[PDB]
Specification:
The structure is a homodimer of 532-residue chains. Chain A has one domain (1-532): Alpha/Beta hydrolase fold, catalytic domain (Rossmann fold, 3-Layer(aba) Sandwich). Chain A contains 16 helices and 16 strands. Chain A has helices at 76-79, 130-136, 148-152, 165-180, 198-208, 235-248, 256-264, 268-274, 302-308, 326-332, 346-356, 362-371, 381-408, 441-444, 457-476, 515-531; strands spanning 4-7, 10-13, 15-18, 23-31, 54-56, 93-98, 106-112, 139-142, 186-196, 218-222, 233-234, 292-293, 316-321, 415-420, 498-502, 509-511. An 11-stranded mixed beta sheet of chain A has the order 3-4-6-8-7-9-10-13-14-15-16, sandwiched between helices. A 3-stranded mixed beta sheet of chain A has the order 1-2-5, with no helix packed on it. In chain A, helix 12 packs antiparallel against helix 16 and helix 13 (381-408) packs across helix 16. Chain A is globular and about 70 Å long. Chain A binds chain B through residues 363, 366-367, 370, 374-376, 511-512, 515-516, 519-520, 523-524, 527-528, 531-532, and chain B through 363, 366-367, 370, 374-376, 511-512, 515-516, 519-520, 523-524, 527-528, 531-532. Chains A, B: Terminates signal transduction at the neuromuscular junction by rapid hydrolysis of the acetylcholine released into the synaptic cleft. May be involved in cell-cell interactions.
Chain lengths: 532, 532
């Protein structure tokens, strides 16, 4: 039977699903690790033990225990990101969408969801692999991993919570795809991993980490890179936050064993209720438990790794959205509202800068303010709003990704850069938010192809172009069709630095994506903060 | 007789001179102080002793001993600024141009020449007061003062070279105009002092210095203000340079008396041959002997004086030229040439920045470079040239003058700001230099009215407009005609910050003259250099 597959872990029974008035196979909730419950909490994942009989993979699995956004109850705009399944510590499963008839050895794409390392699910509607699997004829895999304290608590030195166990979760899932995807029709030597936000940062971390390098061929990074100021911390800050977490739940803090044991006796929702109380600064776009430079998963510091060429050399495709920061200002900076134009005063602009660059001294806050203010129109509320918006995006997503791409391209075997600047017509968020963080995803998974969702005809055309780029790149290492007549997505080179805009208009090639600001955030500010 | 005048110092015999096919009286070389020779060198000026008989004031006086530019022998462009008379330490005289018939009590204008405090003469062709005296019907006075070491050597604490004796020279001349201009038809209670470069800085210093405040009514400052980074030094740096000057001429340095006496036995040309060897840094737009904050001429520091409103409150008219820096880059920065487009490479751009902001640490040099570089076109030789040009002008003339005008307007009784951006058609300097430092002067003195000099018809029209502005302002405190139908030069206010462009096109009002950069040079950089 086409829905029956025999893997090295046991037999699996999938289910047939309808897609664009046709059908494909889906194997949902296949386990790749033992349930990390009880004494296993905070610990590294263990391989799932083989099972007898047939595993029923016809329904989605549970979602990892996580913080749930309730800033706008009912609002589809925000709930479409919340977990749509029972949350549980027993969350390590993966989903596979296979074309029909089953391929013999086709291209594989493994998706890693984002969520600031504190949230995210593989079962969201936006992440439905069937449209893409169907339209491009590839085996689509989406894995899951532990987030929040459950996946990133770090007490370096002990083996009960070494840290980065959330990244080890992903590596585990990748190891399974490597050892079993062949039985689903996929080609293990042609797997592209791709992600967004924290997922984009994760993809960049497997490219850097020696233990993960051999498990995939190519990589796609969307709005996120490993060297982002929010994606990692030192073992010291990791330890400092683990302790404070324990202090918030009144735990015996005499020793790591003391602390860990107390944290293991706690109910999931208790660690989550106080998780945000451990951040060192009053800030925006920063998260409690994230990856930590431990000397294992990451040999040395990320910057020296990028400078020494110590990382997997292959082809990569990456880019960012036009308005990456608006989402965090809405939820955290004073002055912004979901229901108003949110024109910001000088007062709130500067409060926003303090919140966006939390680690900067007064001299630094002054440098940032000067760099993003038009003194010929300093009280223009719309200019201060977009100025604040640019700051959060540049400092957190764009300038860090341009540093990675420029360092990578020096040792890589091919780079393709995009800039997504199209605001979907059916967006429910206000206009002042623009091309929002995470909304390029819907085009990548092809939601515009389904009429009932209500996208324009040009938006569906865009979705197919992007789906063909990602897929054609996953198969060949080049987003372009060999002898096509269409426009060519030029290659990014250390010299020319070309990139393309991605919208519903005739393709246009550009150069030096936001250089002015990137030089400020990557060369000047770091230096200033260090000398002072 | 109309050419005979009896002053409180003695009788003076002037001469009739032709101007625009007419005539006016001229009293040239009237002395206002005793010849500062011999033992009087470096000492404060003494009032000229009355004389019997008639003083012959029909020919220009000598020029103060000074450095003479020989960078372009023959070149009119540079020689028109060199002394056109025998140089001599006996240089303290003043020139008066009186309308004919002699007025009874008309407006007086006293001109103070510029020259970086190391050069300058009242007898240059460009400074001929007859055209202005004639055209606007005002008594025009041009004084002289000692420059270089002769007028600014400062050994604070001693009375043999207290410092600022060059400013005391000007004050002396002003005291004479105050006590005698009435006998020439001028009104002593309506004297406007006005100057350019070092002269503009001098005018601003009489506005600040308690001893000079009562000697004039209004002031006009062109391309220069008291708080310019090149116009003054501390008593310590003044002392440090006086000593080094003495070290260069092998003088006994055991005591001030030792040093001063040795410097007095030296021939004028000997102090001038080594004058430039005392600058602390390799620099551009910096001069050896300039005014010094001594606690006498200047009560406290200039910044606290401007902040406390401690200065003469009256009306002032000031402005700057579009390309104030090009002249110093040509003579001192590597890459620039009088005979080429001078496109600058990245190498020379940065060498230029090091030369322009001599007192900045590496972090500061980086801030400046970042603020003036277009990273989307960093190797564009024309952009690096104009970028360097903007830096020198902004840091040395424009941003400092905007700080003064903004501080003054808070306690003043009226401010009028201009931006001169018209390049004369007969300029002999290359085009890349633009609207050069000191070339608005020719329009102020009305040289465009004399056909033989070869100016366009619109240039002569501009010269009359400007001459009427300066003169109408000198008489009333407002550059505009009471019930005129012409365009109005708006008043500059702390709130609106309006200013006008001054060229051959229909007047246009603007706001916040170069705010972006002015905030950088006045608020951020100072702060950065102080914290680091």
């Amino acid at each position: 039977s086409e829905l029956l597959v025999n893997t090295k872990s046991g037999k699996v029974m999938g289910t047939r699903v309808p897609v664009l008035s046709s059908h494909i196979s889906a194997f949902l909730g296949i386990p790749f690790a033992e349930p990390p419950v009880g004494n296993m909490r905070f610990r590294r994942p263990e391989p799932k033990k083989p099972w007898s009989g047939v595993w029923n993979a016809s329904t989605y699995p549970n979602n990892c225990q996580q913080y749930v956004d309730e800033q706008f109850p009912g609002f589809s705009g925000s709930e479409m990101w919340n977990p749509n399944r029972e949350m549980s510590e027993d969350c390590l499963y993966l989903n596979i969408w296979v074309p029909s008839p089953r391929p013999k050895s086709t291209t594989v794409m493994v998706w890693i969801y984002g969520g600031g390392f504190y949230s995210g699910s593989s079962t969201l509607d936006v992440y439905n692999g069937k449209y893409l699997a169907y339209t491009e004829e590839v085996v689509l895999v989406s894995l899951s991993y532990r987030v929040g304290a459950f996946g990133f608590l770090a007490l370096h030195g002990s083996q009960e919570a070494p840290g980065n166990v959330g990244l080890l979760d992903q590596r585990m899932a990748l190891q399974w795809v490597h050892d079993n995807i062949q039985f689903f029709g996929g080609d293990p030597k042609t797997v592209t991993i791709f992600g967004e936000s924290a997922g984009g940062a994760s993809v960049g971390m497997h490219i850097l980490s020696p233990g993960s390098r051999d498990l995939f061929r190519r990589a796609i990074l969307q709005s996120g890179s490993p060297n982002c100021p929010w994606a990692s911390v030192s073992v010291a800050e990791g330890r400092r936050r683990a302790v404070e977490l324990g202090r918030n739940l009144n735990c015996n803090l005499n020793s790591d064993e003391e602390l860990i044991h107390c944290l293991r006796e706690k109910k999931p929702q208790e660690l989550i209720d106080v998780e945000w109380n451990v951040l060192p600064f009053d800030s925006i776009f920063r998260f409690s438990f994230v990856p930590v430079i431990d000397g294992e998963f990451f040999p040395t510091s990320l910057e020296s790794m990028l400078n020494s060429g110590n990382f997997k050399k292959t082809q990569i495709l990456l880019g960012v959205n036009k308005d990456e920061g608006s989402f965090f200002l809405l939820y955290g900076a004073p002055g912004f509202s979901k229901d108003s134009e949110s024109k910001i005063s000088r007062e709130d602009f500067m409060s926003g800068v303090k919140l966006s660059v939390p680690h900067a001294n007064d001299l630094g806050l002054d440098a940032v303010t000067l760099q993003y203010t038009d003194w010929m129109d300093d009280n223009n509320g719309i200019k201060n709003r977009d100025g604040l918006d640019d700051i959060v995006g540049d400092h957190n997503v764009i300038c860090p990704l341009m540093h990675f791409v420029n360092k990578y391209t020096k040792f890589g075997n091919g780079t393709y850069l995009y800039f997504f600047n199209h605001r979907a017509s059916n967006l429910v968020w206000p206009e002042w938010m623009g091309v929002i963080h995470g909304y390029e995803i819907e085009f990548v998974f092809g939601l515009p192809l389904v009429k009932e969702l209500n996208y324009t005809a040009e938006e569906e055309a865009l979705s197919r172009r992007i789906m063909h780029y990602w897929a054609t790149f996953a198969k060949t290492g080049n987003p372009n069709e060999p002898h096509s007549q269409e426009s060519k997505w030029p290659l990014f080179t250390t010299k020319e630095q070309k990139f393309i805009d991605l919208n519903t208009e005739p393709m246009k090639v550009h150069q030096r994506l936001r250089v002015q600001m990137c030089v400020f955030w990557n060369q000047f500010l770091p230096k200033l903060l260090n000398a002072t």
